[PDB]
């Protein structure tokens, strides 16, 4: 799955949301994918239980999280969402987050070779966090996704 | 596990090697970790079988591969190796590789949140592939690893 098409098909870009804490922020990012049927409802409980037991395992760079769990915890199909908050929330390891890109992968192989390269392309644009946060409409975010496509991560 | 310390403890930096094909290139990168006991011998057969059945799932950017398999396929402990070839080899998807950084992770959580950020920091240095390939001694590669430490991927 390609980011743009996942976003469109899942209607999973939801911007300018307010979360009081990390568990809420996480709920907001996965809910769009429960509604589309990309993931089962349990996927949510899994991310939270994994987070509580292990700490955040998905805060790739400061400002962003890619919340996910194992495929076996209720992924039906490959999908992504993107949620931006109006204020950062603090995760359990002291890390602040304002942008959440939830990930549903049907295998570790596609997580590593297909999903992560596309996520890192997006976030390596200049001022990617600040620009994502100033996006008002899904079309704006997708214009950013287009611009990420000349990343070396995307060549194969 | 930190890259430098994995490299030192596992003596798993082996430079200027010649491989005729992709299966050999892969053998060379994992062998150092079998010798140290980071992985069981079967880890090798797994990478090859997974590759044959799925295609390369670890060629993050052109020129490099991070060959790996699931923890259950014989990882004893977290470790890395680094192998550079004298000529590129072609993988099954048409992709050329000259640098191999084999990865042993005890869980998908550490693969994603600990191993990949460190690997991407190394490879985002300027001319990282060309500089890795001109390294003669493990100490040279480790000087590069030091220089990667100011990456934003490494801040948490």
PDB file of C-alpha atoms in Angstrom:
ATOM      1  CA  UNK A   1       0.000   0.000   0.000  1.00  0.00           C
ATOM      2  CA  UNK A   2       0.948   3.529  -0.964  1.00  0.00           C
ATOM      3  CA  UNK A   3       0.412   6.335   1.649  1.00  0.00           C
ATOM      4  CA  UNK A   4      -1.808   8.631  -0.527  1.00  0.00           C
ATOM      5  CA  UNK A   5      -4.150   5.906  -1.617  1.00  0.00           C
ATOM      6  CA  UNK A   6      -4.370   4.466   1.934  1.00  0.00           C
ATOM      7  CA  UNK A   7      -5.224   7.933   3.243  1.00  0.00           C
ATOM      8  CA  UNK A   8      -7.940   8.453   0.590  1.00  0.00           C
ATOM      9  CA  UNK A   9      -9.478   4.979   0.762  1.00  0.00           C
ATOM     10  CA  UNK A  10      -9.492   4.930   4.588  1.00  0.00           C
ATOM     11  CA  UNK A  11     -10.475   8.608   5.033  1.00  0.00           C
ATOM     12  CA  UNK A  12      -7.896   8.445   7.674  1.00  0.00           C
ATOM     13  CA  UNK A  13      -6.412  11.949   7.613  1.00  0.00           C
ATOM     14  CA  UNK A  14      -8.011  13.825  10.560  1.00  0.00           C
ATOM     15  CA  UNK A  15      -6.430  17.169  11.391  1.00  0.00           C
ATOM     16  CA  UNK A  16      -6.393  19.718  14.225  1.00  0.00           C
ATOM     17  CA  UNK A  17      -7.579  17.342  16.957  1.00  0.00           C
ATOM     18  CA  UNK A  18      -7.214  17.795  20.691  1.00  0.00           C
ATOM     19  CA  UNK A  19      -6.042  14.951  22.988  1.00  0.00           C
ATOM     20  CA  UNK A  20      -5.466  15.300  26.727  1.00  0.00           C
ATOM     21  CA  UNK A  21      -3.013  12.465  26.935  1.00  0.00           C
ATOM     22  CA  UNK A  22      -1.109   9.829  25.089  1.00  0.00           C
ATOM     23  CA  UNK A  23      -3.828   7.128  25.287  1.00  0.00           C
ATOM     24  CA  UNK A  24      -6.333   9.500  23.731  1.00  0.00           C
ATOM     25  CA  UNK A  25      -3.844  10.577  21.039  1.00  0.00           C
ATOM     26  CA  UNK A  26      -3.373   6.894  20.230  1.00  0.00           C
ATOM     27  CA  UNK A  27      -7.143   6.255  20.172  1.00  0.00           C
ATOM     28  CA  UNK A  28      -7.605   9.104  17.678  1.00  0.00           C
ATOM     29  CA  UNK A  29      -5.035   7.699  15.279  1.00  0.00           C
ATOM     30  CA  UNK A  30      -6.425   4.162  15.078  1.00  0.00           C
ATOM     31  CA  UNK A  31     -10.138   4.876  15.124  1.00  0.00           C
ATOM     32  CA  UNK A  32     -10.239   5.902  11.461  1.00  0.00           C
ATOM     33  CA  UNK A  33      -8.841   2.414  10.583  1.00  0.00           C
ATOM     34  CA  UNK A  34     -11.341   0.585  12.778  1.00  0.00           C
ATOM     35  CA  UNK A  35     -14.111   2.526  10.942  1.00  0.00           C
ATOM     36  CA  UNK A  36     -12.800   1.526   7.534  1.00  0.00           C
ATOM     37  CA  UNK A  37     -12.261  -2.116   8.580  1.00  0.00           C
ATOM     38  CA  UNK A  38      -8.463  -1.988   8.051  1.00  0.00           C
ATOM     39  CA  UNK A  39      -8.063  -3.226  11.622  1.00  0.00           C
ATOM     40  CA  UNK A  40     -10.224  -5.070  14.181  1.00  0.00           C
ATOM     41  CA  UNK A  41     -11.246  -3.102  17.330  1.00  0.00           C
ATOM     42  CA  UNK A  42      -8.698  -5.034  19.455  1.00  0.00           C
ATOM     43  CA  UNK A  43      -5.829  -3.336  17.593  1.00  0.00           C
ATOM     44  CA  UNK A  44      -6.370  -0.338  19.808  1.00  0.00           C
ATOM     45  CA  UNK A  45      -6.192  -2.282  23.112  1.00  0.00           C
ATOM     46  CA  UNK A  46      -3.019  -3.964  21.788  1.00  0.00           C
ATOM     47  CA  UNK A  47      -1.148  -0.697  21.098  1.00  0.00           C
ATOM     48  CA  UNK A  48      -2.035   0.529  24.573  1.00  0.00           C
ATOM     49  CA  UNK A  49      -1.113  -2.712  26.341  1.00  0.00           C
ATOM     50  CA  UNK A  50       2.155  -2.929  24.378  1.00  0.00           C
ATOM     51  CA  UNK A  51       2.953   0.663  25.174  1.00  0.00           C
ATOM     52  CA  UNK A  52       2.195   0.248  28.918  1.00  0.00           C
ATOM     53  CA  UNK A  53       4.295  -2.950  29.078  1.00  0.00           C
ATOM     54  CA  UNK A  54       7.214  -1.913  26.886  1.00  0.00           C
ATOM     55  CA  UNK A  55       7.235   1.872  26.605  1.00  0.00           C
ATOM     56  CA  UNK A  56       6.664   3.695  23.285  1.00  0.00           C
ATOM     57  CA  UNK A  57       8.363   1.630  20.596  1.00  0.00           C
ATOM     58  CA  UNK A  58       7.377   3.961  17.680  1.00  0.00           C
ATOM     59  CA  UNK A  59       8.539   7.475  18.265  1.00  0.00           C
ATOM     60  CA  UNK A  60      10.981   7.615  15.326  1.00  0.00           C
ATOM     61  CA  UNK A  61      12.013  11.223  15.695  1.00  0.00           C
ATOM     62  CA  UNK A  62      10.847  13.929  18.105  1.00  0.00           C
ATOM     63  CA  UNK A  63       7.356  15.312  17.435  1.00  0.00           C
ATOM     64  CA  UNK A  64       6.055  12.163  15.711  1.00  0.00           C
ATOM     65  CA  UNK A  65       4.766   8.644  16.534  1.00  0.00           C
ATOM     66  CA  UNK A  66       3.845   5.731  14.241  1.00  0.00           C
ATOM     67  CA  UNK A  67       1.583   3.728  16.622  1.00  0.00           C
ATOM     68  CA  UNK A  68       1.239   0.017  15.656  1.00  0.00           C
ATOM     69  CA  UNK A  69       1.089  -3.550  16.983  1.00  0.00           C
ATOM     70  CA  UNK A  70       1.866  -7.045  15.497  1.00  0.00           C
ATOM     71  CA  UNK A  71      -0.299  -8.121  12.459  1.00  0.00           C
ATOM     72  CA  UNK A  72      -1.797 -10.863  14.649  1.00  0.00           C
ATOM     73  CA  UNK A  73      -3.382  -8.267  16.954  1.00  0.00           C
ATOM     74  CA  UNK A  74      -6.178  -7.637  14.378  1.00  0.00           C
ATOM     75  CA  UNK A  75      -4.839  -6.213  11.141  1.00  0.00           C
ATOM     76  CA  UNK A  76      -7.160  -7.150   8.208  1.00  0.00           C
ATOM     77  CA  UNK A  77      -5.390  -5.106   5.663  1.00  0.00           C
ATOM     78  CA  UNK A  78      -2.426  -2.727   5.118  1.00  0.00           C
ATOM     79  CA  UNK A  79      -3.369   0.918   5.914  1.00  0.00           C
ATOM     80  CA  UNK A  80      -2.245   4.155   7.422  1.00  0.00           C
ATOM     81  CA  UNK A  81      -3.798   7.132   9.156  1.00  0.00           C
ATOM     82  CA  UNK A  82      -2.502  10.605   9.973  1.00  0.00           C
ATOM     83  CA  UNK A  83      -3.697  12.708  12.879  1.00  0.00           C
ATOM     84  CA  UNK A  84      -2.269  16.122  13.974  1.00  0.00           C
ATOM     85  CA  UNK A  85      -2.880  17.580  17.465  1.00  0.00           C
ATOM     86  CA  UNK A  86      -3.333  21.254  18.431  1.00  0.00           C
ATOM     87  CA  UNK A  87      -0.901  20.795  21.352  1.00  0.00           C
ATOM     88  CA  UNK A  88       1.695  18.080  21.939  1.00  0.00           C
ATOM     89  CA  UNK A  89       1.011  15.219  24.378  1.00  0.00           C
ATOM     90  CA  UNK A  90       3.775  13.609  26.452  1.00  0.00           C
ATOM     91  CA  UNK A  91       4.383   9.853  26.107  1.00  0.00           C
ATOM     92  CA  UNK A  92       5.603   7.694  29.060  1.00  0.00           C
ATOM     93  CA  UNK A  93       9.343   8.053  28.152  1.00  0.00           C
ATOM     94  CA  UNK A  94       9.172  11.897  28.371  1.00  0.00           C
ATOM     95  CA  UNK A  95       8.802  12.269  24.604  1.00  0.00           C
ATOM     96  CA  UNK A  96       6.493  14.931  23.161  1.00  0.00           C
ATOM     97  CA  UNK A  97       4.251  14.158  20.144  1.00  0.00           C
ATOM     98  CA  UNK A  98       2.163  16.308  17.902  1.00  0.00           C
ATOM     99  CA  UNK A  99       1.749  14.176  14.727  1.00  0.00           C
ATOM    100  CA  UNK A 100       0.526  10.563  14.681  1.00  0.00           C
ATOM    101  CA  UNK A 101       0.787   8.263  11.715  1.00  0.00           C
ATOM    102  CA  UNK A 102      -0.785   4.895  12.656  1.00  0.00           C
ATOM    103  CA  UNK A 103       0.342   1.959  10.684  1.00  0.00           C
ATOM    104  CA  UNK A 104      -1.395  -1.319   9.861  1.00  0.00           C
ATOM    105  CA  UNK A 105       0.897  -3.907   8.192  1.00  0.00           C
ATOM    106  CA  UNK A 106      -0.061  -7.495   7.319  1.00  0.00           C
ATOM    107  CA  UNK A 107       3.519  -8.762   7.904  1.00  0.00           C
ATOM    108  CA  UNK A 108       6.859  -7.559   9.327  1.00  0.00           C
ATOM    109  CA  UNK A 109       8.213  -7.751   5.789  1.00  0.00           C
ATOM    110  CA  UNK A 110       5.909  -5.038   4.488  1.00  0.00           C
ATOM    111  CA  UNK A 111       6.338  -2.965   7.736  1.00  0.00           C
ATOM    112  CA  UNK A 112      10.090  -2.828   7.061  1.00  0.00           C
ATOM    113  CA  UNK A 113      10.377  -2.719   3.332  1.00  0.00           C
ATOM    114  CA  UNK A 114       7.232  -0.841   2.245  1.00  0.00           C
ATOM    115  CA  UNK A 115       5.700   1.207   5.161  1.00  0.00           C
ATOM    116  CA  UNK A 116       8.764   2.687   6.968  1.00  0.00           C
ATOM    117  CA  UNK A 117      10.558   4.027   3.894  1.00  0.00           C
ATOM    118  CA  UNK A 118       7.355   5.985   2.963  1.00  0.00           C
ATOM    119  CA  UNK A 119       6.906   7.307   6.462  1.00  0.00           C
ATOM    120  CA  UNK A 120      10.508   8.469   6.687  1.00  0.00           C
ATOM    121  CA  UNK A 121      10.310  10.189   3.229  1.00  0.00           C
ATOM    122  CA  UNK A 122       7.326  12.288   4.487  1.00  0.00           C
ATOM    123  CA  UNK A 123       9.027  13.296   7.736  1.00  0.00           C
ATOM    124  CA  UNK A 124      12.347  14.182   6.106  1.00  0.00           C
ATOM    125  CA  UNK A 125      10.826  17.051   4.089  1.00  0.00           C
ATOM    126  CA  UNK A 126      11.934  20.427   5.448  1.00  0.00           C
ATOM    127  CA  UNK A 127      10.043  21.523   8.541  1.00  0.00           C
ATOM    128  CA  UNK A 128       7.826  18.409   8.050  1.00  0.00           C
ATOM    129  CA  UNK A 129       6.372  18.514  11.570  1.00  0.00           C
ATOM    130  CA  UNK A 130       5.646  22.235  11.410  1.00  0.00           C
ATOM    131  CA  UNK A 131       4.156  22.003   7.958  1.00  0.00           C
ATOM    132  CA  UNK A 132       1.977  18.907   8.835  1.00  0.00           C
ATOM    133  CA  UNK A 133       0.637  20.763  11.896  1.00  0.00           C
ATOM    134  CA  UNK A 134      -0.338  23.830   9.714  1.00  0.00           C
ATOM    135  CA  UNK A 135      -2.346  21.579   7.279  1.00  0.00           C
ATOM    136  CA  UNK A 136      -6.065  22.310   7.263  1.00  0.00           C
ATOM    137  CA  UNK A 137      -7.333  19.835   4.654  1.00  0.00           C
ATOM    138  CA  UNK A 138      -6.426  16.316   3.590  1.00  0.00           C
ATOM    139  CA  UNK A 139      -5.462  17.701   0.140  1.00  0.00           C
ATOM    140  CA  UNK A 140      -2.654  19.734   1.758  1.00  0.00           C
ATOM    141  CA  UNK A 141      -1.161  16.692   3.451  1.00  0.00           C
ATOM    142  CA  UNK A 142      -1.355  14.726   0.194  1.00  0.00           C
ATOM    143  CA  UNK A 143       0.470  17.562  -1.606  1.00  0.00           C
ATOM    144  CA  UNK A 144       3.256  16.907   0.964  1.00  0.00           C
ATOM    145  CA  UNK A 145       3.065  13.171   0.267  1.00  0.00           C
ATOM    146  CA  UNK A 146       3.614  13.914  -3.446  1.00  0.00           C
ATOM    147  CA  UNK A 147       6.683  16.006  -2.652  1.00  0.00           C
ATOM    148  CA  UNK A 148       8.182  13.100  -0.601  1.00  0.00           C
ATOM    149  CA  UNK A 149       8.266  10.885  -3.682  1.00  0.00           C
ATOM    150  CA  UNK A 150      11.746  12.026  -4.802  1.00  0.00           C
ATOM    151  CA  UNK A 151      13.265  10.576  -1.594  1.00  0.00           C
ATOM    152  CA  UNK A 152      15.978   7.876  -2.192  1.00  0.00           C
ATOM    153  CA  UNK A 153      13.948   5.660   0.159  1.00  0.00           C
ATOM    154  CA  UNK A 154      11.259   5.610  -2.517  1.00  0.00           C
ATOM    155  CA  UNK A 155      13.379   4.617  -5.578  1.00  0.00           C
ATOM    156  CA  UNK A 156      12.755   0.855  -5.276  1.00  0.00           C
TER     157      UNK A 156
ATOM    158  CA  UNK B   1      22.249  -2.685  21.617  1.00  0.00           C
ATOM    159  CA  UNK B   2      24.330   0.162  20.256  1.00  0.00           C
ATOM    160  CA  UNK B   3      25.983  -0.292  16.784  1.00  0.00           C
ATOM    161  CA  UNK B   4      29.626   0.407  17.868  1.00  0.00           C
ATOM    162  CA  UNK B   5      29.563  -1.931  20.804  1.00  0.00           C
ATOM    163  CA  UNK B   6      27.798  -4.671  18.778  1.00  0.00           C
ATOM    164  CA  UNK B   7      30.458  -4.335  16.082  1.00  0.00           C
ATOM    165  CA  UNK B   8      33.311  -4.564  18.629  1.00  0.00           C
ATOM    166  CA  UNK B   9      31.866  -7.371  20.749  1.00  0.00           C
ATOM    167  CA  UNK B  10      30.865  -9.459  17.702  1.00  0.00           C
ATOM    168  CA  UNK B  11      33.980  -8.649  15.620  1.00  0.00           C
ATOM    169  CA  UNK B  12      31.471  -8.341  12.925  1.00  0.00           C
ATOM    170  CA  UNK B  13      32.945  -5.617  10.715  1.00  0.00           C
ATOM    171  CA  UNK B  14      34.573  -7.431   7.745  1.00  0.00           C
ATOM    172  CA  UNK B  15      35.643  -5.194   4.879  1.00  0.00           C
ATOM    173  CA  UNK B  16      36.678  -5.486   1.222  1.00  0.00           C
ATOM    174  CA  UNK B  17      35.112  -8.904   0.603  1.00  0.00           C
ATOM    175  CA  UNK B  18      34.232 -10.440  -2.737  1.00  0.00           C
ATOM    176  CA  UNK B  19      30.875 -12.196  -3.355  1.00  0.00           C
ATOM    177  CA  UNK B  20      29.781 -13.636  -6.696  1.00  0.00           C
ATOM    178  CA  UNK B  21      26.108 -13.370  -5.967  1.00  0.00           C
ATOM    179  CA  UNK B  22      23.464 -12.292  -3.553  1.00  0.00           C
ATOM    180  CA  UNK B  23      23.340 -15.574  -1.568  1.00  0.00           C
ATOM    181  CA  UNK B  24      27.068 -15.371  -0.952  1.00  0.00           C
ATOM    182  CA  UNK B  25      26.846 -11.676  -0.001  1.00  0.00           C
ATOM    183  CA  UNK B  26      24.163 -12.652   2.508  1.00  0.00           C
ATOM    184  CA  UNK B  27      26.248 -15.558   3.859  1.00  0.00           C
ATOM    185  CA  UNK B  28      29.185 -13.198   4.453  1.00  0.00           C
ATOM    186  CA  UNK B  29      27.098 -10.775   6.481  1.00  0.00           C
ATOM    187  CA  UNK B  30      25.604 -13.309   8.896  1.00  0.00           C
ATOM    188  CA  UNK B  31      28.571 -15.593   9.423  1.00  0.00           C
ATOM    189  CA  UNK B  32      30.291 -13.213  11.843  1.00  0.00           C
ATOM    190  CA  UNK B  33      27.142 -13.409  14.066  1.00  0.00           C
ATOM    191  CA  UNK B  34      26.972 -17.200  13.920  1.00  0.00           C
ATOM    192  CA  UNK B  35      30.648 -17.235  15.061  1.00  0.00           C
ATOM    193  CA  UNK B  36      29.942 -14.961  18.004  1.00  0.00           C
ATOM    194  CA  UNK B  37      26.769 -16.864  18.981  1.00  0.00           C
ATOM    195  CA  UNK B  38      24.457 -13.864  18.369  1.00  0.00           C
ATOM    196  CA  UNK B  39      22.414 -16.086  16.060  1.00  0.00           C
ATOM    197  CA  UNK B  40      21.914 -19.841  15.543  1.00  0.00           C
ATOM    198  CA  UNK B  41      23.169 -21.317  12.215  1.00  0.00           C
ATOM    199  CA  UNK B  42      19.575 -21.589  10.893  1.00  0.00           C
ATOM    200  CA  UNK B  43      19.322 -17.781  10.747  1.00  0.00           C
ATOM    201  CA  UNK B  44      21.214 -17.934   7.495  1.00  0.00           C
ATOM    202  CA  UNK B  45      18.893 -20.500   5.836  1.00  0.00           C
ATOM    203  CA  UNK B  46      15.936 -18.365   6.994  1.00  0.00           C
ATOM    204  CA  UNK B  47      17.147 -15.144   5.318  1.00  0.00           C
ATOM    205  CA  UNK B  48      17.710 -17.052   2.091  1.00  0.00           C
ATOM    206  CA  UNK B  49      14.377 -18.886   2.175  1.00  0.00           C
ATOM    207  CA  UNK B  50      12.543 -15.649   3.036  1.00  0.00           C
ATOM    208  CA  UNK B  51      14.319 -13.823   0.264  1.00  0.00           C
ATOM    209  CA  UNK B  52      13.581 -16.560  -2.330  1.00  0.00           C
ATOM    210  CA  UNK B  53       9.901 -16.686  -1.278  1.00  0.00           C
ATOM    211  CA  UNK B  54       9.236 -12.978  -0.817  1.00  0.00           C
ATOM    212  CA  UNK B  55      11.940 -11.027  -2.628  1.00  0.00           C
ATOM    213  CA  UNK B  56      14.443  -8.783  -0.792  1.00  0.00           C
ATOM    214  CA  UNK B  57      12.550  -7.125   2.047  1.00  0.00           C
ATOM    215  CA  UNK B  58      15.583  -5.150   3.391  1.00  0.00           C
ATOM    216  CA  UNK B  59      17.115  -2.993   0.738  1.00  0.00           C
ATOM    217  CA  UNK B  60      16.332   0.359   2.403  1.00  0.00           C
ATOM    218  CA  UNK B  61      18.072   2.585  -0.094  1.00  0.00           C
ATOM    219  CA  UNK B  62      20.128   1.753  -3.188  1.00  0.00           C
ATOM    220  CA  UNK B  63      23.596   0.325  -2.501  1.00  0.00           C
ATOM    221  CA  UNK B  64      22.704  -1.146   0.907  1.00  0.00           C
ATOM    222  CA  UNK B  65      20.894  -4.150   2.464  1.00  0.00           C
ATOM    223  CA  UNK B  66      20.057  -4.938   6.107  1.00  0.00           C
ATOM    224  CA  UNK B  67      19.560  -8.742   5.845  1.00  0.00           C
ATOM    225  CA  UNK B  68      17.440 -10.216   8.702  1.00  0.00           C
ATOM    226  CA  UNK B  69      14.708 -12.717   9.589  1.00  0.00           C
ATOM    227  CA  UNK B  70      12.124 -13.025  12.462  1.00  0.00           C
ATOM    228  CA  UNK B  71      13.592 -13.416  16.035  1.00  0.00           C
ATOM    229  CA  UNK B  72      12.116 -16.933  16.128  1.00  0.00           C
ATOM    230  CA  UNK B  73      14.402 -18.054  13.284  1.00  0.00           C
ATOM    231  CA  UNK B  74      17.368 -18.329  15.731  1.00  0.00           C
ATOM    232  CA  UNK B  75      18.295 -14.982  17.227  1.00  0.00           C
ATOM    233  CA  UNK B  76      19.937 -15.473  20.682  1.00  0.00           C
ATOM    234  CA  UNK B  77      20.833 -11.904  21.179  1.00  0.00           C
ATOM    235  CA  UNK B  78      20.657  -8.416  19.584  1.00  0.00           C
ATOM    236  CA  UNK B  79      23.632  -7.783  17.228  1.00  0.00           C
ATOM    237  CA  UNK B  80      24.761  -6.279  13.990  1.00  0.00           C
ATOM    238  CA  UNK B  81      27.438  -6.890  11.394  1.00  0.00           C
ATOM    239  CA  UNK B  82      28.792  -4.784   8.541  1.00  0.00           C
ATOM    240  CA  UNK B  83      30.319  -6.187   5.379  1.00  0.00           C
ATOM    241  CA  UNK B  84      31.474  -4.165   2.302  1.00  0.00           C
ATOM    242  CA  UNK B  85      32.011  -5.779  -1.132  1.00  0.00           C
ATOM    243  CA  UNK B  86      34.636  -4.880  -3.766  1.00  0.00           C
ATOM    244  CA  UNK B  87      31.946  -4.964  -6.489  1.00  0.00           C
ATOM    245  CA  UNK B  88      28.164  -4.746  -6.165  1.00  0.00           C
ATOM    246  CA  UNK B  89      25.998  -7.884  -6.416  1.00  0.00           C
ATOM    247  CA  UNK B  90      22.498  -7.825  -7.924  1.00  0.00           C
ATOM    248  CA  UNK B  91      19.553  -8.986  -5.785  1.00  0.00           C
ATOM    249  CA  UNK B  92      16.475 -10.739  -7.312  1.00  0.00           C
ATOM    250  CA  UNK B  93      14.460  -7.466  -7.728  1.00  0.00           C
ATOM    251  CA  UNK B  94      17.207  -5.889  -9.925  1.00  0.00           C
ATOM    252  CA  UNK B  95      18.675  -3.950  -7.001  1.00  0.00           C
ATOM    253  CA  UNK B  96      22.446  -3.533  -6.681  1.00  0.00           C
ATOM    254  CA  UNK B  97      24.173  -3.845  -3.268  1.00  0.00           C
ATOM    255  CA  UNK B  98      27.642  -3.088  -2.086  1.00  0.00           C
ATOM    256  CA  UNK B  99      27.238  -2.678   1.717  1.00  0.00           C
ATOM    257  CA  UNK B 100      25.540  -5.214   4.006  1.00  0.00           C
ATOM    258  CA  UNK B 101      24.513  -4.525   7.559  1.00  0.00           C
ATOM    259  CA  UNK B 102      22.968  -7.719   9.012  1.00  0.00           C
ATOM    260  CA  UNK B 103      20.666  -7.257  11.887  1.00  0.00           C
ATOM    261  CA  UNK B 104      19.744  -9.577  14.751  1.00  0.00           C
ATOM    262  CA  UNK B 105      16.828  -8.300  16.898  1.00  0.00           C
ATOM    263  CA  UNK B 106      15.182 -10.194  19.771  1.00  0.00           C
ATOM    264  CA  UNK B 107      11.756  -8.603  19.068  1.00  0.00           C
ATOM    265  CA  UNK B 108      10.004  -6.463  16.425  1.00  0.00           C
ATOM    266  CA  UNK B 109       9.868  -3.708  19.028  1.00  0.00           C
ATOM    267  CA  UNK B 110      13.635  -3.340  19.205  1.00  0.00           C
ATOM    268  CA  UNK B 111      13.970  -3.805  15.372  1.00  0.00           C
ATOM    269  CA  UNK B 112      11.732  -0.755  14.883  1.00  0.00           C
ATOM    270  CA  UNK B 113      12.568   1.499  17.751  1.00  0.00           C
ATOM    271  CA  UNK B 114      16.259   0.771  18.419  1.00  0.00           C
ATOM    272  CA  UNK B 115      17.970  -0.900  15.365  1.00  0.00           C
ATOM    273  CA  UNK B 116      16.498   0.971  12.335  1.00  0.00           C
ATOM    274  CA  UNK B 117      17.021   4.508  13.631  1.00  0.00           C
ATOM    275  CA  UNK B 118      20.767   3.693  14.145  1.00  0.00           C
ATOM    276  CA  UNK B 119      21.099   2.124  10.736  1.00  0.00           C
ATOM    277  CA  UNK B 120      19.448   5.070   9.013  1.00  0.00           C
ATOM    278  CA  UNK B 121      21.666   7.600  10.920  1.00  0.00           C
ATOM    279  CA  UNK B 122      24.805   5.829   9.543  1.00  0.00           C
ATOM    280  CA  UNK B 123      23.545   5.749   5.955  1.00  0.00           C
ATOM    281  CA  UNK B 124      22.363   9.364   5.943  1.00  0.00           C
ATOM    282  CA  UNK B 125      25.899  10.738   6.413  1.00  0.00           C
ATOM    283  CA  UNK B 126      27.174  12.376   3.225  1.00  0.00           C
ATOM    284  CA  UNK B 127      28.414   9.911   0.631  1.00  0.00           C
ATOM    285  CA  UNK B 128      27.842   7.154   3.263  1.00  0.00           C
ATOM    286  CA  UNK B 129      27.989   4.297   0.747  1.00  0.00           C
ATOM    287  CA  UNK B 130      31.116   5.631  -0.936  1.00  0.00           C
ATOM    288  CA  UNK B 131      32.830   6.333   2.344  1.00  0.00           C
ATOM    289  CA  UNK B 132      31.897   2.877   3.856  1.00  0.00           C
ATOM    290  CA  UNK B 133      33.308   1.173   0.741  1.00  0.00           C
ATOM    291  CA  UNK B 134      36.661   3.110   1.097  1.00  0.00           C
ATOM    292  CA  UNK B 135      37.049   1.951   4.776  1.00  0.00           C
ATOM    293  CA  UNK B 136      40.048  -0.296   5.345  1.00  0.00           C
ATOM    294  CA  UNK B 137      39.829  -0.950   9.096  1.00  0.00           C
ATOM    295  CA  UNK B 138      37.034  -1.406  11.609  1.00  0.00           C
ATOM    296  CA  UNK B 139      38.239   1.775  13.393  1.00  0.00           C
ATOM    297  CA  UNK B 140      37.372   3.830  10.285  1.00  0.00           C
ATOM    298  CA  UNK B 141      33.816   2.529  10.176  1.00  0.00           C
ATOM    299  CA  UNK B 142      33.401   3.214  13.900  1.00  0.00           C
ATOM    300  CA  UNK B 143      34.626   6.795  13.359  1.00  0.00           C
ATOM    301  CA  UNK B 144      31.651   7.055  10.933  1.00  0.00           C
ATOM    302  CA  UNK B 145      29.344   5.532  13.549  1.00  0.00           C
ATOM    303  CA  UNK B 146      30.444   8.260  15.995  1.00  0.00           C
ATOM    304  CA  UNK B 147      29.656  10.967  13.451  1.00  0.00           C
ATOM    305  CA  UNK B 148      26.099   9.542  12.980  1.00  0.00           C
ATOM    306  CA  UNK B 149      25.280  10.209  16.625  1.00  0.00           C
ATOM    307  CA  UNK B 150      24.039  13.783  16.025  1.00  0.00           C
ATOM    308  CA  UNK B 151      21.193  12.438  13.837  1.00  0.00           C
ATOM    309  CA  UNK B 152      17.645  13.383  15.076  1.00  0.00           C
ATOM    310  CA  UNK B 153      16.852   9.655  14.893  1.00  0.00           C
ATOM    311  CA  UNK B 154      19.295   9.187  17.758  1.00  0.00           C
ATOM    312  CA  UNK B 155      17.966  11.845  20.211  1.00  0.00           C
ATOM    313  CA  UNK B 156      15.675   9.471  22.147  1.00  0.00           C
TER     314      UNK B 156
END
